Every structure is written in structure tokens, then in C-alpha cells.
């Protein structure tokens, strides 16, 4: 059947195309920022500790001393 052929063929073509888009987009979208995120965040720990963690340090130091 040519109508059934057209239906399943076009529909599965769309699915295959969308899945190729899925693979590429998902991989880049979730890979590229991830490294940048964790790098900036380990540095963020190194920075935020110098405002907040030191605040806890000074507080403990004074209250205990």
C-alpha cells in the first residue's frame, strides 16, 4: 500500500531525524557547559570560602576565644 508506505516512511523519517538532533543536541548541551560549570564552581568554592567560610572561622575563633 502506497498510502501506508508514505505514512510509515515519512513518520519514521521524522523520528530518525529528530533522534539525530536529540543525540547531537543533548550531548553538546549537557557536555559543553558541564566542564565550565564545575571549573567555575570549584573556583567559586575557592572564592566564596574567602567571604563565608572565613566568616564562620572568625565567628568560631572569637566566640571560643
Amino acid at each position: 500500500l502506497s498510502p501506508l508506505e508514505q505514512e510509515v516512511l515519512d513518520e519514521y523519517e521524522r523520528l530518525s531525524e529528530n533522534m539525530k538532533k536529540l543525540a547531537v543536541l543533548l550531548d553538546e548541551l549537557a557536555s559543553a557547559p558541564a566542564t565550565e560549570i564545575l571549573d567555575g564552581l570549584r573556583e567559586l568554592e575557592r572564592k566564596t570560602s574567602l567571604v563565608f567560610t572565613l566568616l564562620k572561622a572568625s565567628v568560631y575563633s572569637i566566640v571560643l576565644q
Binding site: 574567602l50 572565613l54 572561622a57 572568625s58 575563633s61 572569637i62
Partner: protein, 68 residues
């Protein structure tokens, strides 16, 4: 005798100045004692920023410091 009368009178004005002096000093110490209470808070905050600067300096020196 007359010398003694003169001496007693000078001593009287002396003693009056003594009492006035010391009463003012009582007010002085009382004032400072009341003030003192309004200083420990500031002292705590001073030492807080002090140790803040000390610890952050030690940590900055540990990491890539950006001083001279």
C-alpha cells in the same frame, strides 16, 4: 594661735575643694563605667574584622595571591 586659726580656715576651704573634686571624680568613673558597656560590642566587631583580614590574607597567600 592666730596662725592656727588661719590654718584651720585655709584647711576648711581645702577640704571643701577636696570633696567637690572627688565628687566630680565619682561622676567621672560612673560615666566611664556606663560608657564601657557601650564599647565591648565595638571591640568584638573590631577583632572580628581583624581576624577576618588575617585569615583571608593567609588564604590568599595560600592561593594565587594578587598583592605586590
Amino acid at each position: 594661735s592666730p596662725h592656727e586659726h588661719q590654718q584651720n580656715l585655709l584647711l576648711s576651704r581645702i577640704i571643701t575643694n577636696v570633696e567637690k573634686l572627688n565628687e566630680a571624680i565619682m561622676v567621672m568613673n560612673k560615666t566611664l563605667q556606663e560608657i564601657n558597656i557601650q564599647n565591648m560590642n565595638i571591640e568584638l566587631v573590631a577583632q572580628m574584622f581583624k581576624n577576618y583580614q588575617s585569615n583571608v590574607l593567609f588564604h590568599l597567600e595560600a592561593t594565587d595571591n594578587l598583592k605586590d
